[PDB]
Amino acid sequence: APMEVAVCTDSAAPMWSCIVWELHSGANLLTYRGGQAGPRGLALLNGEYLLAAQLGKNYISAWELQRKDQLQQKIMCPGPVTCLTASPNGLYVLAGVAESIHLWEVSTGNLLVILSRHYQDVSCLQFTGDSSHFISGGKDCLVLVWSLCSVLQADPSRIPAPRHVWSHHALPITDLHCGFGGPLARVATSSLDQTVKLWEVSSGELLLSVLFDVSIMAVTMDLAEHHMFCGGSEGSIFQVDLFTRERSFHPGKVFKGHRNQVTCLSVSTDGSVLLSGSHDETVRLWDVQSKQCIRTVALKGPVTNAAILLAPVSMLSSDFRPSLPLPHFNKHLQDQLRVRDEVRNLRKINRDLFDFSTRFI
Amino acid sequence: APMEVAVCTDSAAPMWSCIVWELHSGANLLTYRGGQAGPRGLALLNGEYLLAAQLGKNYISAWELQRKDQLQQKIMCPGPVTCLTASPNGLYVLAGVAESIHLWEVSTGNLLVILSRHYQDVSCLQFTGDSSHFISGGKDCLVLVWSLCSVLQADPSRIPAPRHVWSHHALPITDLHCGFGGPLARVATSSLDQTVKLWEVSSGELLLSVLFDVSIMAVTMDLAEHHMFCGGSEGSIFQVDLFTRERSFHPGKVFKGHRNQVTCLSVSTDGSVLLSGSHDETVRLWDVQSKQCIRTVALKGPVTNAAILLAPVSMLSSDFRPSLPLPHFNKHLQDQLRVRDEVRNLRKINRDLFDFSTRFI
Amino acid sequence: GPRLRLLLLESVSGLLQRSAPHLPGLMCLLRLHGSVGLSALGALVSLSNARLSSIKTRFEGLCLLSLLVGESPTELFQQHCVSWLRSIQQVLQTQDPPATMELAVAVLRDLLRYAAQLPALFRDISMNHLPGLLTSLLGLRPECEQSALEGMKACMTYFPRACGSLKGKLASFFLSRVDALSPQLQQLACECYSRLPSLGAGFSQGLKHTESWEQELHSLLASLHTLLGALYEAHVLLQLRQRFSGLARCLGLMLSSEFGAPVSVPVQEILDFICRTLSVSSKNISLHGDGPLRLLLLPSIHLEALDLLSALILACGSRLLRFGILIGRLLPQVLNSWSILSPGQERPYSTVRTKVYAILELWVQVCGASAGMLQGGASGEALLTHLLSDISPPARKGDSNANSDVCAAALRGLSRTILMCGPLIKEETHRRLHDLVLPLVMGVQQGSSPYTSSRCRRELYCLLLALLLAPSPRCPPPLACALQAFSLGQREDSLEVSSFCSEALVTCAALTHPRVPPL
Amino acid sequence: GPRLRLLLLESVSGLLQRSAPHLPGLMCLLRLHGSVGLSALGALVSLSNARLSSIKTRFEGLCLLSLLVGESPTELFQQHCVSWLRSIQQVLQTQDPPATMELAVAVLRDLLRYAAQLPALFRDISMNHLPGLLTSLLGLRPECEQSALEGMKACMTYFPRACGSLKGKLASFFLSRVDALSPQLQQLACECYSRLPSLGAGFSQGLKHTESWEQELHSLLASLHTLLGALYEAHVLLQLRQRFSGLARCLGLMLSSEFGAPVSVPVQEILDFICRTLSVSSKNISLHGDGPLRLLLLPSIHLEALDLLSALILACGSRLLRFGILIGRLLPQVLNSWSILSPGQERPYSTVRTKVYAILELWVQVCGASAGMLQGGASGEALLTHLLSDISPPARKGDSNANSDVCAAALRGLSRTILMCGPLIKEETHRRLHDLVLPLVMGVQQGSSPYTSSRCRRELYCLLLALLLAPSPRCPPPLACALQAFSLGQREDSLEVSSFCSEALVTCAALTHPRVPPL
């Protein structure tokens, strides 16, 4: 894990809108200014662009990772943007526009599809590890699992349908977390009904359901799915061991120190370090094993986004430029690409050369 | 599973010493006569020879699979033979001669090593699936795990030592069963102390220990290790589900119908069919799911050996002859082999031919 | 040591001036010792130049200069690269036998590759020598045209900007050779022609390069459409077939090769062309006049379209997801077009089916779990029926390994598809696969079948492991039978099969002995 | 359809008598259609015979007869095989260019392969024609000697009994060519010479064949010992090196080729010879007179001994377990013999190290968990140190993929060894591997390193999966970091790396979501 970084945005954003800082150092590696990113509205496109759904606005701002105030062009949407995500392969951008989901392809910028299966505003969007499926949660208390293949290959006459519909939650969904893999992945959802549910993507079955005494505003898991971290509405983070449907968490497994609701949760690659952003205007960095706050960083407003991620070469190289420019994202309903390390090895070239030499003789 | 067969020997052996009969048919596919095989003394060498440790004698008889009364040459041993086994790859033959283990290599017949770590007579010998390790149990209440590499590569000055020594059993070992794999395999041991123990070969740790109210004279598991079948000293077979350190079996999981001690247990490949030989002079064939006796075969004496195994081409082809003759097994302390289906495919030969044709032009 | 070995070679070079046949072996030993990476190096360079000066010892000096270029220190290389390049250019115009020209072109390719990475040397070599080197390559004899192409390729690989002044002339050298009956010459000509848009300055961040690339692709598409329309309308039919194959291979190489600037790939046009090519199966041709010749030529046209589809898939990756419906309708259509016996022998049209199955495997590789293969519909059902027919054994002159190769290709495609999309795949498919594969793996260990080749048995065991690893959530895989099959196969005589079965048993032990409690 | 296409070819054969260059393409199409696999067949046979009769159209008739032999019905083949064989033999003595001889020899090989499986035709062809065919092959011109060898190989592959009468003469044809500077001619001569003991009647269940095989092996061992003693005692040194390589390759081919009868393989003698060859590393040679030439030649002798060890391992399998101690002492000794920088460039003696690592991988493959590699002792520690040095990246003219190939070989050996012997391997080894590999996989996705080649990255991910799959029971593997690495690699541009990471993620999902409770 070479230089894990924390990417944080708050609501006030007086002089900086986004801050990228090293986990174990705390020095501001990168800063961005220009707007106010909304909750769940921060995404990294292709490891080279920073997309932020503006808080309360109808558009999405973009930055280059190596340039401050790099707001140039906007992704117009018909209505307000509630959530924003990008596929891990960097090919598609999902935005929750009111009750609908707009899908753009980064290759051309075309608005590929507008999925309107939710009857209430979409609260969160997530992709799987291999970008085969994406999961949408809204204030309609529904968790929809969409196959990307089905969504992209749909005749506009027959509207695309979700692969799975999950209505076990009774209150609006607040967060989703997807594990590694595609069909074999597992999805963690958290709701205002004080419940966190673990589902299997392929079978669509409910694997686990943990009940808490407070509303759960954030949820995450480590890559190995050893534990599950749930951030509640009173500033308390609960750890549930997935090695032990319908449990009921009751109170050594809880992190203390946040005052207002914890809305962002992220785990380092090794799973020993936890990042938590709260509405108390603070991002806290915790030791998972000892449940002790390693670090506390004060912001100028309620934290809307906070994540731990491996810093790409973009954040490390001060001379980095994106390989492709951002296209123009169409507001209403080839391929731009670079065509394309199989270079011949050393006995490859030597064997070719001595084949030529022998062929002379 | 093309034509699973049951190979059974009893003590009296009036006219036949070994019988191979189809599981679902019951007709005697093959018969062998000449002697009286002892308990745990039946082995198939390389899928082409039948080795039987003679009951109460100092030698081992051999048969060809396609010839009756094919007793020709004997494996002399310094003392009485108590158990006999062959490696699944067919390269080595282990015999328990009194308190020692004699290892022969089938390639040359040389007595490679005499391991004398047991201080009492060896009761049973088993190999792992890949022949990397072999496990020996004796009346000394010890279970020894030997690495074949360490045993074969030992300077005669420094005697080979067991990789693992397991002394948790309190009474002489009656049976051993080894699962698939090598280092990752698991071994089931059963003792007269009414206990069946499951160990891990690599770590040497005790994974499980199940206690019964009667002495356990036989033990086996299916390939997937879903269940464990333990044949006791009163004619009762117990099934323990390995999906649930120190248990204690207490009495729907037990097979009824044998009168005397069940000494042989074997499971079909699919795990739906169980074979059980008892001292009541009977081999019974059971349905695993319904715990019902499919078939009962009466022999002329107490059953000493009984197994279920996939019939090789040797048992099916009436014209089969072994590729190599059995060597002379030395009584006292490069390689004979055939040197080494990679034949060129159809576009292999066609591409060669058109390369030649183009090279002409 | 190196000094001792270099002085040795310098001293025992008097065998040359007879150890000339031994020179390549000594030279391989010298580069294996790493003695090159400097009085010894200077002496070796001088001896190489002296040998190249003569007309009878040119091979020895050329070999010595090949070693020098291969392992020169960065200091010696900079000071002597211009002299080596001039010597190679001088040799390239000597009316020497084509083997000497081939050796000189190989050495020149190495020299140009090692010179393009030195900014000071790169520009000097480029402006002061590359036009002359290209003119010398264009001036080679027809018998050495093959050699010339490699040289041109080298000049267009590491010095593209300076090749622009002769770019048009280079084009005249390539169109003449894309319609060449020699497969190696045709392939090399296609590779050279695919590099034409990358030549020149390429102003405005490669905007000119992008425009040239797109114009060349569209012109190739138009020419391919004209040729295909002419084919489907004796010697002339063969000429059009050869030109069609060359042009389509050029287009596929342009799709699947590195290019400096971003380009806009027209996916719809290429897919429409591929569908148009594949839409004539057996009945539109009829049988009259030159009709049987078109019927004879048709599988080659279909194979060339399949190669084009493979190149497009490689170029685009997962971006073809919205055309996956067309792709999954195309594959069983081609399988139905070329489907036709006695046990053994060999089914016809096997190469086309192998190409289709390779397309399927590559598509699953680039699309992951989104490939949508064998997941409902008539096209998926037809593809599955064809796969299961091509992997089933056929249950006197003939081959023991009959239809082994289509069987192996279908097994690879099926195992990749299962491993990546098994949970999404319906349970009846999984049950059919179990009922077909478990008896097969149990019976290969226990006549004339495709599974008499070890590669087919390895692919069958891979399919078994894929069925164990990616099963339907509602149809548990047969674990005990697969474990028995792997145990039987790990004792097989074939090394690859036994090794795969050992590794598969390790994976199955991981599958059978869990490390954490389930949920 | 077939009849329509065959009649088409018969009618449009008038292009020949100009579509002669197009004939191979038409012929590939004809065998792809399966129209052959009978009036049309008879007409094609007659036209082929007529073309072969002339001296200018021999290539066309030879191609036609090649197709006929390739896909004849078992009825036509039986009735016309003798005529085809006589025509091929007649062509083999025509003073034709060597390309015609090569084509005729390929067709003859196909004919002999397809004739040996018909008991009625086999004996007739054998007794009535094989001595004459062998005499014709022996009588070819020197320029066609290459071709002759293949023909002889064919005669010794499918008709071994009837080659005995000329066996001694065949031997005189092979010793002359095992010391040949052309790698293809030398390899073919070694392959032909390795088949000498299989010739003749072989009475008493192949007892004579077994005795001849053992005598030839012992004579080869004695000759190799004499040559090695002479080497370690200018042009003559090269001659002895070439003869040593040829003889050792013959012995290795005899070890690793199919033989009719069981044989007794002397393992101790061959191992003693291999150890004797490998026991001269760098200091026994010194530097005086022809000493530097011996130092130059030494890596080739070591490579040839390593090839011999590979052949012995393939022949014997797990039976070399009691010599595994010697093998595991030999491998780090050769690694220490050839170990010697600036970042990038290339380490010397890379081919020898790659051969050693391939030996290690093959040994683990044939011995399973009993290989006993990296399991204590000085030799295992030295081997591990060499492996870890060869997989570590080196942390201006040069190659971007510097030392990639030794890195890939060591990665393959390490991953196979871990996957098969990980539980037995000590935990400090596993921890060292984690501390070396996890930063590597995290940093390949995020200069001049061996891991700039996709094959090295694929092997590194394979080693990571092997560490996940076969860990120490007392040292749990890092699962979350490996999952992150696989997720990063599945988004890589390289197709092989991304595909492997997808499959490895499926396996890791199996490892992470258990299906049954543990114990």
Author numbering:
A (entry chain B), B (entry chain A): 3 to 246, 251 to 257, 262 to 343, 395 to 401, 407 to 427
C (entry chain D), D (entry chain C): 30 to 46, 61 to 80, 85 to 280, 305 to 411, 416 to 470, 511 to 561, 566 to 638
Reproduce passages from the article.
Here we show that PELP1 serves as the central scaffold for the human Rix1 complex whose members include WDR18, TEX10, and SENP3. Mammalian PELP1 is composed of two domains, including a well-conserved N-terminal domain referred to as the Rix1 domain (based on homology with the yeast homologue Rix1), and a poorly conserved proline- and glutamic acid-rich C-terminal domain. The Rix1 complex is a large and essential molecular assembly containing the conserved PELP1-WDR18-TEX10 protein components (RIX1-IPI3-IPI1 in S. cerevisiae), with the inclusion of the SUMO protease SENP3 in mammals.
Single-particle reconstruction resulted in a 2.7 Å resolution map composed of a C2 symmetric PELP1-WDR18 heterotetramer assembly. The refined structure reveals a highly interconnected tetrameric assembly centered around two dimerized PELP1 Rix1 domains, which form an α-solenoid structure resembling a horseshoe. The C-terminus of WDR18 threads through the center of the hollow core towards the bottom of the assembly. Our cryo-EM structure allowed visualization of all eleven LxxLL motifs and one of three PxxP motifs embedded in PELP1. Seven of PELP1’s LxxLL motifs are localized on the internal (nonsolvent) face of the PELP1-WDR18 assembly, while the remaining four motifs are solvent exposed. The structure of the PELP1-WDR18 subcomplex revealed that the majority of PELP1’s LxxLL motifs play direct roles in mediating subcomplex formation through hydrophobic inter-subunit interactions between LxxLL motifs and ordered helices. Instead, this supports a mechanism in which WDR18’s C-terminal tail plays a required structural role in anchoring WDR18 to PELP1 and then fostering PELP1 dimerization through “capping” by the β-propeller domain. Interestingly, each of the four solvent-exposed LxxLL motifs in PELP1 had their leucine residues buried away from the solvent surface, most of which reach back into the PELP1 structure to facilitate α-helical arrangements. Therefore, we reason that these PELP1 LxxLL motifs are not compatible with steroid receptor binding via the AF-2 mechanism, raising questions about PELP1’s ability to coregulate steroid receptors in the context of the PELP1-WDR18 assembly.
